[PDB]
């Protein structure tokens, strides 16, 4: 049970509890710092989100979240055929190919509705889908020119080590030093105006040149779902993107600015029963990257 | 420019309430904020509240359930209205325009700032005095003198503070030093002026203070000579 | 409540805020004569108002860490007074009260020796059935100075009153001293005394009823 | 910290019992090389 109060909107807490020491009859009365997404009522008594569910693994603080370019190879008699098709969709047959012993570097970004740090499109903007004319199939545009986005969580955390046992140490968020400010990502208006007009030309050769193509938000689901959802140098990033799908397109200094939200109990994946605690990034977060890719999904104009 | 002077009663009887105005000179009332900021003796400076250009209420906490500042426009002046006063809300009581910034430390958008106000001109000052003792009006008695010799005026048992000494009605002002008041055991403040005046001009130019104590509405003047 | 600092005349002054911000700030810097109208000497961390010398300087906030600190380079005598420092920052509320006054006393002032005048009875008051003496002391620094009366050669210590040294302007001391006397108790000695010690010395001005 | 005091390891590292039926005997081993080696 958590002794959360506000911090001097509401959304960071700051939480008191009785925790155990390094000696088996001993107790301590420690103070963590918690977003609002971790926890849930019963001073006011709180508790974090993952308790009811699902044990909990802090996330070993010498490992990194970084998306390394991995290749994948092909056992000795085996073969990889690559698709030299500049404007190569989905299926079909591939004019041009080559073979490979491995894939390119391929960087495992774990990432939603923007797919960030990939690789780009040759010539022009593609599209791909199952069947198009299938609501229920995501459709994956790939884009050739990348549209830059950069995110930064502003305030400067702190780390503070609790040794809750013989050597285990869970590493709690101490304090705010300075300013208490909101994370966000920008991306260039123009930039992205010109590439959301770039899929909408892509978008008319399926639906037709007359109709008006529109994009609007997420209509629900969770937050991984209804949210960019990535990690941005060790935190979990989760940005609003009415901002960036708020247009209707008819048949003929700037910068769009994304609140997010910083989570900690992440479930990863899709498992229901493995949850893990990231532990706070010290100083203040800022990265940089390209979202090269879309994940869409039309309406069942 | 703007320049302010305030004007008040000078003695409140306790529990009672304290009326106060401010008459800015040189400048439109109501395009600044305005604030009242008065000096308890031995106490630090206590800001009262402030009016808004917009003619909004904000007051100190410490106060608020006594404060109730208003602002005429037909007039450069507002008034500040103190009630249940006690003892210890006798201060000197300013009057300053303030002046409104925004700090700005992160996005405007999010709200990422806050407002700090800072006052930059001041009234003079004006002397507030609670106590259920009546007023009282002084009398003043001639000192008179003996190269270069000291002539004065003796301010004796007044109440409350303070009292103003002119000499000539504001001709003679080079070698004046009036002294700061006693209060006696008695409960009354006696003050004490005096001029430095070359030898010569002592049986030929004639020297007249003048005395006034405003809670009294007296004055008065007075001759000294050997 | 009040904090001492103590500089010398000429020398640069460190004056510390109070409190310490938590966020970015807004600093406002008064000085404050006793009995006096405040002086706004600095608004924005560093911005001066218009007519306020450049030895006054306060700091800005570029680097977070770095705190408020009020510089008073030459320090003149007429620098003595209390010093506020009106703290405003992103995470602490509204700061109505002002800042601790820091009363600056500036040392290696040069000494100088009082004035004193004293004066006899006027007859408008003795023919009011009242004798009054007014020791007039003025234009002495260290401000401090203990009033002796005494009637022909005897002490006096009885219906004596004392100002306090209140400062004068041009950055001495001065302190009124009255004795009040019956009308026969004035005519009924030789001569009346004002024995002013000041620092380590003594003067005296006698006044006898002719 | 009657005296009070508590094990060496506590504020370091967990601890564990050394299982009391393997034995610390020095035994000697033979290193080999895969063939073709
Ligand atoms: C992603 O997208 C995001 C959104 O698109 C984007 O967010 C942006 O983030 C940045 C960085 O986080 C933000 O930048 C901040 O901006 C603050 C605001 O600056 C603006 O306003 C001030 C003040 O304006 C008033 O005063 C001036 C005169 O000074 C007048 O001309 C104005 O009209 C105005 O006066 C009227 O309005 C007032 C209301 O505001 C009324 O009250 C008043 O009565 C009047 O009616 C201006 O000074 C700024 O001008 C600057 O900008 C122009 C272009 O616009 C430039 O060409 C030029 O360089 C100008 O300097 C601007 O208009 C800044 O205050 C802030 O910087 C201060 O704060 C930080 C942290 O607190 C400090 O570290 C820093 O050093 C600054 O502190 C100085 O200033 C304060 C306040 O005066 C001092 O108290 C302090 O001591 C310090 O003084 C020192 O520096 C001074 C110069 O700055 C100097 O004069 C002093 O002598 C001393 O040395 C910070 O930069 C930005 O706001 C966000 N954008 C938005 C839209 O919110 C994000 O970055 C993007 N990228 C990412 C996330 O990667
Ligand atoms: C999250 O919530 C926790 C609480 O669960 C906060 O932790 C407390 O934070 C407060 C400040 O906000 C701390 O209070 C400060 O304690 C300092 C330590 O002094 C103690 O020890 C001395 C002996 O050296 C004693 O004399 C003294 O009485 C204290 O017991 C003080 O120095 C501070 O004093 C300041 O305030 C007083 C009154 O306001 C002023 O008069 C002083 O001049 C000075 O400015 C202050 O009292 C408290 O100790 C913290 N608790 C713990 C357990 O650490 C977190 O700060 C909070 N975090 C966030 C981000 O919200
Ligand atoms: C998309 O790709 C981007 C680039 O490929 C990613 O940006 C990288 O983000 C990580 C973490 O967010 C950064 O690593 C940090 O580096 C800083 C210090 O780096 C600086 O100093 C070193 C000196 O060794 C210098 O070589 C660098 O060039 C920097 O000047 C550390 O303090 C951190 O602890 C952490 O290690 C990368 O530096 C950064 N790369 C670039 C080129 O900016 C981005 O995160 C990717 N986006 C996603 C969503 O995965
Ligand atoms: C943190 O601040 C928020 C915002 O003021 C508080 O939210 C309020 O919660 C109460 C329930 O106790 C509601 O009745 C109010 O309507 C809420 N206000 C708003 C604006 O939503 C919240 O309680 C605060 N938390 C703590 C621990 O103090
Ligand atoms: C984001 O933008 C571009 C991808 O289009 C990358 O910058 C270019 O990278 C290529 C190959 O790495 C170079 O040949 C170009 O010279 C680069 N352009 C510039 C202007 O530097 C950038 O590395 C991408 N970042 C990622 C993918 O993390
Ligand atoms: C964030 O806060 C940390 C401290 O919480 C700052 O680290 C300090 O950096 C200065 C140098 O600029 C050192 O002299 C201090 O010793 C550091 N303090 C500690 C505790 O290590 C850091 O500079 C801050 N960074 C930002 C961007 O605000
Ligand atoms: C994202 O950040 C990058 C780098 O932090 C910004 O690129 C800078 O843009 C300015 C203005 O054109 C240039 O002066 C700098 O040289 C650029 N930096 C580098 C490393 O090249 C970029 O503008 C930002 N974009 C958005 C949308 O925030
Ligand atoms: C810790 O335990 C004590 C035992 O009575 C209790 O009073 C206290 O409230 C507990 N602290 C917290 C933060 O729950
Ligand atoms: C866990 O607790 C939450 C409280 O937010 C509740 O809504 C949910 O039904 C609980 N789930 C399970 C599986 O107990
Ligand atoms: C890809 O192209 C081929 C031939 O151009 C076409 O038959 C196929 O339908 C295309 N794929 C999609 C998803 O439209
Ligand atoms: C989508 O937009 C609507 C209206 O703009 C808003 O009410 C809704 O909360 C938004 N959904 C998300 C997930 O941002
Ligand atoms: C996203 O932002 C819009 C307005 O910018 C807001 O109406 C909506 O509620 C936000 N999304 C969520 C999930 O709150
Ligand atoms: C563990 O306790 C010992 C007491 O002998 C102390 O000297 C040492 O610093 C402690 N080490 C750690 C890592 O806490």
């Known amino acids: 049970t958590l002794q959360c109060t506000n911090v001097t909107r509401g959304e960071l807490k700051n939480c008191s509890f009785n925790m155990t020491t390094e000696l088996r009859d001993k107790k301590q009365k420690v103070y963590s710092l918690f977003y609002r997404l971790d926890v849930v009522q019963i001073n006011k008594e709180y508790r974090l989100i993952n308790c009811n569910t699902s044990a909990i693994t802090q996330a070993c603080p010498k490992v990194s979240f970084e998306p390394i370019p991995i290749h994948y190879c092909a056992p000795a008699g085996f073969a990889i055929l690559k698709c030299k098709d500049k404007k190569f969709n989905g299926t079909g047959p591939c004019p041009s190919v080559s073979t490979v012993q491995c894939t390119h570097g391929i960087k495992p970004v774990v990432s939603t509705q923007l797919l960030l740090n990939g690789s780009l499109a040759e010539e022009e903007v593609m599209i791909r889908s199952e069947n198009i004319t299938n609501n229920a199939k995501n459709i994956l545009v790939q884009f050739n020119t990348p549209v830059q986005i950069n995110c930064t969580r502003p305030n400067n955390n702190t780390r503070k080590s609790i040794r809750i046992g013989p050597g285990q140490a869970f590493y709690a968020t101490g304090d705010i030093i300075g300013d208490i400010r909101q994370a966000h990502c920008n991306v260039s208006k123009a930039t992205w105006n010109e590439t959301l007009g770039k899929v909408v030309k892509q978008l008319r050769k399926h639906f037709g040149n007359n109709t008006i193509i529109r994009f609007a938000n997420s209509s629900g689901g969770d937050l991984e779902v209804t949210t960019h959802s990535f990690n941005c140098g060790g935190e979990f990033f989760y940005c609003n993107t009415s901002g960036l799908f708020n247009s209707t397109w008819i048949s003929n200094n700037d910068s769009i600015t994304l609140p997010c939200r910083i989570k900690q109990i992440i479930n990863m994946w899709q498992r229901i029963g493995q949850a893990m605690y990231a532990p706070p990034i010290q100083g203040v977060i800022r990265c940089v990257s390209n979202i090269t890719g879309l994940i869409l999904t039309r309406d069942g104009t | 420019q703007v320049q302010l002077q305030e004007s008040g009663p000078g003695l409140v009887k306790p529990s009672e309430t304290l009326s106060l105005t401010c008459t800015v000179s040189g400048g439109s009332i109501s395009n600044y904020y305005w604030s009242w900021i008065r000096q308890s003796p031995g106490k630090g400076l206590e800001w009262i509240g402030y009016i808004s250009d917009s003619e909004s209420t904000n007051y100190n906490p410490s106060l608020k359930s006594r404060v109730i500042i208003s602002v005429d426009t037909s007039k450069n002046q507002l008034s500040l209205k103190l009630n249940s006063v006690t003892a210890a809300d006798s201060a000197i009581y300013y009057c300053?325009?303030?002046?409104?910034?925004?700090?700005?430390?992160?996005?405007?958008?999010?709200?990422?700032?806050?407002?700090?106000?800072?006052?930059?001109?001041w009234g003079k000052g004006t002397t507030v005095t609670v106590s259920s003792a009546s007023t009282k009006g002084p009398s003043v008695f001639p000192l008179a003198p003996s190269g270069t010799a000291a002539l004065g005026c003796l301010v004796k048992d007044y109440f409350p503070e303070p009292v103003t000494v002119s000499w000539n009605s504001g001709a003679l002002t080079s070698g004046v030093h009036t002294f700061p008041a006693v209060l006696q055991s008695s409960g009354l403040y006696s003050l004490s002026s005096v001029v430095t005046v070359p030898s010569s001009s002592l049986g030929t130019q004639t020297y007249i203070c003048n005395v006034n104590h405003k809670p009294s509405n007296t004055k008065v003047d007075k001759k000294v000579e050997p | 409540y009040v904090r001492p600092l103590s500089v010398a005349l000429g020398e640069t002054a460190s004056i510390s805020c109070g409190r310490q911000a938590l966020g970015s700030r807004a600093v406002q810097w008064y000085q404050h004569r006793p009995g006096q109208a405040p002086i706004l000497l600095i608004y924005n961390n560093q911005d001066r108002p218009s007519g306020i010398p450049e030895r006054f300087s306060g700091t800005p906030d570029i680097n977070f860490g770095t705190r408020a600190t009020l510089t008073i380079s030459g320090v003149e005598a007429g620098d003595e007074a209390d010093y506020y420092c009106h703290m405003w920052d992103s995470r602490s509320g509204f700061s109505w009260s002002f800042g601790g006054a820091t009363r600056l006393t500036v040392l290696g002032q040069p000494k100088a020796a009082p004035s004193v005048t004293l004066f006899p009875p006027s007859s408008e008051e003795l023919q009011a059935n009242k004798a009054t003496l007014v020791c007039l002391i003025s234009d002495f620094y260290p401000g401090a100075v203990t009033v002796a009366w005494k009637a022909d050669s005897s002490p006096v210590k009885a219906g004596v009153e004392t100002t306090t040294p209140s400062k004068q302007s041009n950055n001495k001391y001065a302190a009124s001293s009255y004795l009040s006397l019956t009308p026969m108790q004035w005519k009924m000695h030789k001569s009346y005394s004002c024995q002013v010690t000041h620092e380590g010395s003594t003067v005296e001005k006698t006044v006898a009823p002719t | 910290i009657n005296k009070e005091y508590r094990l060496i390891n506590c504020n370091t590292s967990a601890i564990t019992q050394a299982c009391p039926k393997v034995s610390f005997e020095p035994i000697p081993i033979h290193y080999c090389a895969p063939a073709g080696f």
């Open positions: 300053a325009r303030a002046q409104q910034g925004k700090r700005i430390y992160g996005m405007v958008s999010f709200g990422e700032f806050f407002y700090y106000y800072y006052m930059d001109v």
